[PDB]
Symmetry: D3
Subunit: 217 residues, 6 copies
């Protein structure tokens, strides 16, 4: 028996774990880049642990989600589903990299890390908006919802512009290097870039679900 | 979200409650004071109506909310009827300078108070509702309790109502027939306060069944 | 899901139906028997109330369901009023030992029976409802039929009610004025059984319009 | 979607409005004409009932729609009660050849007209509703206005009702007690036209709170 | 202050812009095929402009979407989301082609353009059904909805059959040519075919959303 | 005029057809592995037939889906949509294999068939839960729903663990063989593995939809 909590709290705790999980991809890739595969394997164990922890929070929620409630149970589940995908993506990406001992070519290392970080920043915005949501639930009234969405869109546009530029730069550099590499490796590098971008796509879906919830009120 | 409804119910209860000292004044022949108490009843009704107006013009503006706007409006409508009923009853009594016959006085007041008690139960359940909103399965216990408490009040008011009508029946031959009919109407109107309170509980119950 | 409501409606119909032999007893001066029949009426009401309580404390616990929990509760509330009305009417009649004047006796019973018939139609539609639930387009035919059947009953009860009031009016000068008013009230109360039955049909109709 | 409801409300208003010339006929001792006017009242009620039947058998068949089918049905039910009330009142008056005492005649007609005016407000809001449907935030102004207009009508009808009952009370000793009670009942029934109109507004308000 | 408009009108105007955006892929690819990369770049600027314009209409709708209304706000948003993806797909595809100066092999040029056009035709059907929807909203009654859906399915089956045949033909010809090409280019040609097909998949989702809306009434 | 049937029955009959369709992939691949392409073509004709049959059941449902009903029409449609994708996936996969006469390398044959079978088992669980759903609709009460979901999650976790292990093993073996193969073939083998896994992903979505339905009650 604790004090009253938002119906959104368990979702926020899940998002926080997910973000921690995705965040670990930076040091994971940084390890792969210095050639320390033993450390990369240990960081992947941290990713796997965070994903397992998220999965437990997710199970808890699915078997618990309720009487009088200010949001739809189904919207919370749909939100949980998208958040969960982010942690699985991070686990999957890191697994494929360990699996192929995939080395990001020297010339692409700096921009790749910048791109990866900006994609993780998108997850960060998703975390931010899910936390900022208590403010609307605790207070809120016809209108404050519109400002919230407008802000969310402004912040996502900024992140998308940067991630789009970095993704182009990265693909342009890879394209210049193709002739120096094995074609299967080349394809897996493009796939890695795409998978990383998927972290940001998934984060956008989180925000879309929030937006749909706000549009039912 | 329930807070403004609770404030309105409180005002409505205060309005209806004044019927006891109102009637007590008439019974001691204090018509000047009964007129003053009716002024307090009218004021409470007017204040209630203001709270009602504000809720009606605000609720629509509500965003995320744990109960239906429409359920709150329906609840408000039922609550409001109670204050209006108290105002109407008191006005008819002043208008006819209606005298309760001596032998009915004590049981009439006991019956009126028990009908008010029914309004009190409605006030109590609307305030206990925060507990359910602030905190599945608990809704059934809450409804079981409200039903238990209402059954107790209903049994008592039914007995009192029977007793009172039996006594009036015995006296009819000593009274003017129009006066008699107005005495029966007064008993019926007072009973209506309890019927309206029951409706408030029903609306709460429907709200809880939607979750 | 409709089954418990059907069981309750059946009990309610049985309760209201007892008003015919109740009144027939009073009309033959059998006040001891009318008291016994009123005991059966009270018992049916009590049993109905129990079924009501169980539904209210269960419905909330319902999972997947083809009708709204709230519609079932609203239906239950209307059905319950019918038994309560029968209990109330019979109690007032015992209380005043109310005698229907000789010349009104036959038409009064015919009118009461026709009002009961309205309760019977409600019972019939609530039972025919399984057919619609067990099996789009068929809902319109069902409502067209209920309206047709009710129009027939309403026409007959309107005529009887007019006839009965016309006869009482002709007799007023030979009776005590309070007794007269109670005779008009009794006619009105009996008519209310049909009004309540109509409300049961309306709630069914709303349920069907949600689909 | 609101159009058929508007047509029905218009018919209902026409039906209730005929109570003024109906009563005026009785007051000038024109019982043959009052019977003819009651025939017009019955006809309007019958036409209203037909429109009602068609809506009930059609609404269900509706596809995409900006309001709830159930809200429209509930609105229709309340509107219909007004025509039925006018028909019932007029029938009781013919049946008893009820004479309003001379001194109450003018204020009675003023009171009846003001109660009709309440029906008129309902008719007006149901027609202004297209404006809201054809075109967020505007719903609050619409409800604020309806409340303002109703408060004005209610104040006037309350005053008239008080005046009329005060005058009847002063005359009771000169009249037959049953006749007196029927005069009070008539005043109450007429007031009910305004109560029903208020319910029509409430249903509109609930519809607007769902959006 | 104009005359009454359908709640669907702003969605129709967005769909129209989206279709215009996707449509530009034909002349875009036609330019790449004659080897005029300067013109292809200029046509991509037209695609990018149409996507930016759509994005503004989309923002407008998201910050506006309402009182009494014949459809669910959330269904409109979900519809908008799918329509938006079509314009982004067109912008993304054209960007990758400019990025790699991707040349469709001679033998595949004619069938590729036919396939691309038929995929754009699917978008066209989506536009058609969104416009035809006013008819159901303006009139409509239990039943007219079923004929609408049946028609929609018939028309989509026809387009799907053709696009499936063209996609097979195109892949079969590419497969015969693989030995003459660089393997990375080969993979990007298959990807291009897939991305183009995605225009039709997205269009189908638009129709699915409409179908779900009709099923709530 | 038959006896009363669950609103879920037509969906169950569709799922059954879908499962039959996906199931045919085992003998289809087994034929491709013994080198009997004539038989593989005949088995694909059986797959195509099952998909066409499913498509007809689907059309029937879409043009029929109702008065009083214990579930949302829209949830049934959304469920149908996911089930349909499984049959299309099976038809698409088999078509690409016939198209390229794609041979699974000897060393990967046994594990590939095991993996394919376990993915089909996921479809099997989806079929199981859709059939078990009548039990909840026929009886059921606040609470039995939670046990149903908990069971579903337990069973899916088991299948996912196995499919994840088999997928890793299979990719690890392919990675060891890459140097012996044409790079385009290599990419298509990875794609095949991914597409097969997609059968299980689609099956999971079926279960997610069921879970959302149960969460509205
Ligand atoms: Cl790529
Ligand atoms: Cl009485
Ligand atoms: Cl009467
Ligand atoms: Cl009165
Ligand atoms: Cl491909
Ligand atoms: Cl892969």
């Amino acid at each position: 028996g604790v004090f009253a909590k938002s119906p959104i709290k368990p979702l926020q705790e899940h998002m926080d774990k997910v973000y921690d999980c995705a965040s670990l991809l930076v040091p994971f890739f940084e390890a792969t880049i210095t050639g320390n595969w033993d450390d990369a394997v240990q960081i992947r164990k941290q990713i796997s642990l965070a994903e397992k922890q998220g999965d437990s929070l997710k199970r808890e929620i699915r078997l618990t989600l309720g009487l009088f409630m200010p949001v739809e149970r189904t919207d919370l589940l749909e939100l949980l589903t998208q958040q969960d995908k982010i942690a699985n993506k991070a686990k999957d990406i890191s697994g494929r990299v360990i699996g192929r001992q995939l080395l990001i070519p020297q010339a692409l290392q700096v921009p790749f890390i910048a791109y990866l970080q900006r994609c993780i920043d998108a997850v960060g915005l998703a975390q931010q908006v899910i936390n900022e949501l208590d403010d609307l639930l605790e207070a809120g009234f016809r209108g404050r919802e519109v400002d919230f969405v407008a802000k969310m869109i402004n912040e996502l546009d900024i992140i998308e512009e940067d991630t789009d530029d970095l993704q182009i730069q990265l693909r342009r550099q890879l394209f210049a290097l193709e002739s120096e590499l094995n074609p299967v490796d080349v394809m897996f590098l493009y796939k890695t870039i795409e998978w990383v971008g998927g972290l940001a796509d998934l984060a956008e879906r989180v925000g879309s679900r929030l937006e749909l919830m706000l549009a039912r009120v």
